[PDB]
């Protein structure tokens with residue numbers, strides 16, 4: 001199962017890890033992708049997860065969008081986890097760099113409650129432009145299921161742990 005995580009709360013754990021390497025090692029039931037509404041996995045966590053699937057995640061995602069149209073900011077869809085997990089839960093956190101409502105971050109984390117255990121990144125962090133300290137606080141105050149957070153950046157991981165209330 002998951003190893004080397006620091007316990008933050010009853011149900012939230014955190015580790016300085018590359019979520020792709022973590023997914024290949026654990027092969028969890030659910031890996032969360034930091035998706036956009038179009039499921040265009042170009043960069044950040046999405047670009048890295050997609051590259052690890054040899055673009056199979058993008059091919060599956062384009063078929064999903066062709067059939068269903070875009071997701072909502074704050075929404076999600078369950079697709080295959082390919083070689084990384086049983087399932088990938090593509091969750092759209094607000095992208096502050098695109099002027100999206102930061103208040104939708106709680107709605108985005110509510111998607112995690114439909115899964116008993118997940119390997120996940122901090123939503124809206126990184127290239128999505130939100131403050132990761134705020135993302136972690138919304139995560140702990142919203143998610144009730146078991147969430148194993150992988151934070152790629154060591155310096156950010158240390159700041160998140162040392163400032164956690």
Ligand SMILES: CCCn1nnc(NC(=O)c2ccco2)n1
Nearest residue numbers: 125126127129130131132153156
């Ligand atoms: C790229 C280094 C790790 N990192 N990942 N997301 C962030 N972002 C921030 O620290 C930030 C954005 C708005 C306020 O603070 N840093």
